[PDB]
C-alpha cells in the first residue's frame, strides 16, 4: 500500500505556521556581527515601497557569453524620507534573553509621534511626555545619571527612530516607529554618537552607498482565505469527480487516526512577514534636488517620477534607493533594509554596476513616452492649448 509513484513534497517545511502576522511593520529579527574596530555607523533602515520599474544595464560578467550587452531588468526603487532619531535604548545581558533596561528621549518630540501612542487623537488631551519633558530644566542630572546607567551596564545598545511622514505623500500622517542597532564599537562612543543626533535628521548617505548589497525583510500582501489549490500550489482533480475539484482527497491513513499536520489544507495566504535575501543597490540620489533621472549614457534631463505620477502612489521628491529584482510587499508598505549578514564574494555581487539608462515611462496606461515635453515634441500640437 505504498505511494506507487514517488514525488516531491508540496509546500515548504520551514515556512509554517503561516498565519496572519503580528506586526504590520516587518519584525527585524536578526542583526549583523558588531565590529568593535570599525567606527560607529547605522545598520538597518525604514522605508516605503513606492516604485517598481524597468532598467537597462551593461552586463559585466567577463568570461561569460553575454559580455558587453544590454539587459532589461526590474528595479524596485524604494523611496524614503530622511529619518529622524527620537532616542536610544540599550539591552543588557542575562542568561534568559536580551532584556531591556532603560530608554532616553529627546526634549521636544514633534506632533508626528504623539499620535502613535494615543490611539484616538481628536478627543485626546495630548499630554504625552509632558511630565517627562520637565526633566531638562535642572543642571544636567536629568539625563546623565541614566546615561551613566546605560554607560556603566548594558552591553548591546539600540536606537529607536521614526520616519518623517510629512514629506512623503500618503494619507497616514502618523509615523511608524522601530529600533535599529549600532554596528560600531567602544559602547561609550556608540551612545555618544546618539548623544548629539537627538531630534536632528540623518539621511541615507550615512551608511547606504553605491554597490552596497542589502536584503529586504517586509510584510507581504494578502488576499484572504484562498483555497488549497492556490495556497500550497497543489494539484487539481480530473473533471469527472463528484463533490469538488479544488481540494485534496487523501489526507492520511487509518492509523494515525488524525490528520497529519503536513497535509496541504485550506486557509490563509499572504500577510506574513517573509524575507528575501541578497539584493543589489544600483544608485542612490540625493533629496533636495531635481533632475536625477538622468545618467551617463542618457543625458536627457528628466525626473525619476514616471509620467504624470505613479500607480496608486503619487510622486517622488526625495532621496531614494534602487533595489534590483523584487522585494516583498506591495505598494505603500513598511519595508526595512538590513545590511549584509555575511561578507559575500559570490562573483555575482560586488561587481561594479554602471546604469546605461533608467526608464520613466507612463506606468499607468500602456506607456508611450518618457519626458513629458517630448510627447508634445512628437505629435506636435493639439486642439487644446498644448
Amino acid at each position: 500500500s505504498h505511494r506507487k509513484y514517488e514525488a516531491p513534497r508540496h509546500g515548504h517545511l520551514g515556512f509554517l505556521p503561516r498565519k496572519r502576522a503580528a506586526s504590520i511593520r516587518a519584525r527585524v529579527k536578526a542583526f549583523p556581527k558588531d565590529d568593535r574596530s570599525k567606527p560607529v555607523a547605522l545598520t538597518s533602515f525604514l522605508g516605503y515601497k513606492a516604485g517598481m520599474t524597468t532598467i537597462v544595464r551593461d552586463l559585466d560578467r567577463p568570461g561569460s557569453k553575454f559580455h558587453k550587452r544590454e539587459v532589461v531588468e526590474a528595479v524596485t526603487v524604494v523611496d524614503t524620507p530622511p529619518v529622524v532619531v527620537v532616542g536610544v535604548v540599550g539591552y543588557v545581558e542575562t542568561p534568559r534573553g536580551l532584556r531591556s533596561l532603560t530608554t532616553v528621549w529627546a526634549e521636544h518630540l514633534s506632533d508626528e509621534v504623539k499620535r502613535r501612542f494615543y490611539k484616538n487623537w481628536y478627543k485626546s488631551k495630548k499630554k504625552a511626555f509632558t511630565k517627562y519633558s520637565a526633566k531638562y530644566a535642572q543642571d544636567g542630572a536629568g539625563i546623565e545619571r541614566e546615561l551613566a546607567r546605560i554607560k556603566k551596564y548594558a552591553s548591546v545598545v539600540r536606537v529607536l527612530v521614526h520616519t518623517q511622514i510629512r514629506k512623503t505623500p500618503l494619507a497616514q500622517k502618523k509615523a511608524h516607529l522601530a529600533e535599529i542597532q549600532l554596528n560600531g564599537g567602544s559602547i561609550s562612543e556608540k551612545v555618544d554618537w546618539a548623544r548629539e543626533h537627538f531630534e536632528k535628521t540623518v539621511a541615507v548617505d550615512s551608511v547606504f552607498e553605491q554597490n552596497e548589497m542589502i536584503d529586504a525583510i517586509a510584510v507581504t500582501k494578502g488576499h484572504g482565505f484562498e483555497g488549497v489549490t492556490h495556497r500550497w500550489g497543489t494539484k487539481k482533480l480530473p473533471r469527472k469527480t463528484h463533490r469538488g475539484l479544488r481540494k485534496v482527497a487523501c489526507i492520511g491513513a487509518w492509523h494515525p487516526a488524525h490528520v497529519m499536520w503536513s497535509v496541504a489544507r485550506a486557509g490563509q495566504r499572504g500577510y506574513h512577514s517573509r524575507t528575501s535575501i541578497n539584493h543589489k543597490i544600483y544608485r542612490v540620489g540625493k533629496g533636495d534636488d531635481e533632475a536625477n533621472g538622468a545618467t551617463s549614457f542618457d543625458r536627457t534631463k528628466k525626473t525619476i517620477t514616471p509620467m504624470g505620477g505613479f500607480v496608486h502612489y503619487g510622486e517622488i521628491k526625495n532621496d531614494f534607493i534602487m533595489v534590483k529584482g523584487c522585494i516583498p510587499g506591495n505598494r505603500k508598505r513598511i519595508v526595512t533594509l538590513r545590511k549584509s549578514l555575511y561578507t559575500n564574494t559570490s562573483r555575482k555581487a560586488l561587481e561594479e554596476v554602471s546604469l546605461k539608462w533608467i526608464d520613466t515611462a507612463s506606468k499607468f496606461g500602456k506607456g508611450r513616452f518618457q519626458t513629458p515635453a517630448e510627447k508634445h515634441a512628437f505629435m506636435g500640437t493639439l486642439k487644446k492649448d498644448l
Binding site: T54, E70, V72, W357, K366, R368, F369, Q370, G380, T381
Partner: protein, 63 residues
C-alpha cells in the same frame, strides 16, 4: 535607450516593450506594443487606419 522606430505604426518604444515578430520569408518585424500586434495579424492594412502615422503621411495632417 537603444533607439527604435516601429515597423508598423512609426511610434517610439525604448526596449523592453513590444513583440518583435518574424515570418517564413525571413522578414523581421517589430511592433510598438500589444495593441499593434493583434490588430495586425488578423490581416488588416496600415494605410487606412487613423491613429498610425502613415495615415497622416498619406492625407498630410501635421507636417
Amino acid at each position: 535607450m537603444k533607439v527604435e522606430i516601429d515597423s508598423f505604426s512609426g511610434a517610439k518604444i525604448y526596449p523592453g516593450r513590444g513583440t518583435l515578430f518574424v515570418r517564413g520569408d525571413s522578414k523581421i518585424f517589430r511592433f510598438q506594443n500589444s495593441k499593434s500586434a493583434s490588430l495586425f495579424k488578423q490581416r488588416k492594412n496600415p494605410r487606412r487606419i487613423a491613429w498610425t502615422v502613415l495615415f497622416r503621411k498619406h492625407h498630410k495632417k501635421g507636417i
